[PDB]
Design a protein around this ligand. Structure first.
Ligand SMILES: Nc1ncnc2c1ncn2[C@@H]1O[C@H](CO)[C@H]2O[P@](O)(=S)O[C@H]21
Length: 214
């Protein structure tokens, strides 16, 4: 009768830790970077001092356990489109199956810290096509929203990560030069507190497609 809270790909303990660690390294490096410090007044909007901001602290709300990539939030069936999504053959067939998710970039905004996921064609079959889509997904390839949440600002909800990624991708839908080089790739400053690290080598994380119940 009733559905999960949401469906998605859940990373193994190992892959989760690899990505989490990479995310944390990025926050530390990004926060220490001259280009980021230079734009602090576009990132925070209060009476903060001239001092340095520690981003690991800023993104204080982090996933407590394994990371995941949400496909469809269902709220046990209360969410629009949940039933329709869950009844798809491909969803039922893929339930419990192993997949690999390709991580192409890490990003930061004043609201969230996340990882961009680039879904395979097979995985795109599990991406919902709802009647109620975020406006921002329009004009971009299906599944562009696909992401993993690494942290959130205090009053932010994990759903914002996907939304932030869509806004970043609309922003880059030409592309200017990078403002820095980090060990894992090039750093871009997209304005309005938004930052993207484009990985030289995509990370591959193992995960299982399944349903989460609160
Ligand atoms: N209305 C929504 N649409 C899409 N995803 C959602 C929605 N509400 C919550 N989520 C996501 O579902 C999970 C549990 O709330 C979280 O994983 P995470 O993708 S990081 O962001 C959250």
């Amino acid at each position: 009768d009733f559905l999960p809270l949401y469906f998605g790909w859940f990373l193994t303990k190992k892959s989760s830790e690899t990505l989490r660690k990479a995310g944390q390294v990025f926050l530390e490096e990004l926060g220490n970077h001259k280009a980021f410090k230079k734009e602090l007044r576009h990132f925070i909007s209060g009476d903060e001092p001239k001092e340095k901001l520690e981003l690991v602290s800023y993104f204080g709300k982090r996933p407590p356990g394994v990371l995941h990539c949400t496909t469809k939030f269902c709220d046990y069936g209360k969410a629009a489109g949940a039933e329709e999504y869950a009844q798809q053959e491909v969803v039922k067939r893929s339930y419990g199956k192993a997949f690999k998710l390709s991580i192409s970039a890490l990003f930061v905004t004043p609201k969230t810290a996340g990882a961009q996921v680039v879904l395979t064609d097979q995985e795109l079959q599990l991406w919902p096509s709802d009647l109620d889509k975020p406006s921002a997904s329009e004009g971009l390839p299906p599944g562009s929203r696909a992401s993993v949440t690494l942290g959130c600002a205090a009053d932010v909800q994990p759903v914002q990560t996907g939304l932030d990624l869509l806004d970043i991708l609309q922003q880059v839908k030409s592309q200017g030069e990078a403002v820095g080089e980090l060990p894992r790739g090039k750093l871009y400053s997209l304005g309005k507190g938004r930052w993207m690290l484009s990985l030289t080598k995509k990370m591959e994380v193992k995960a299982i497609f399944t349903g989460y119940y609160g």
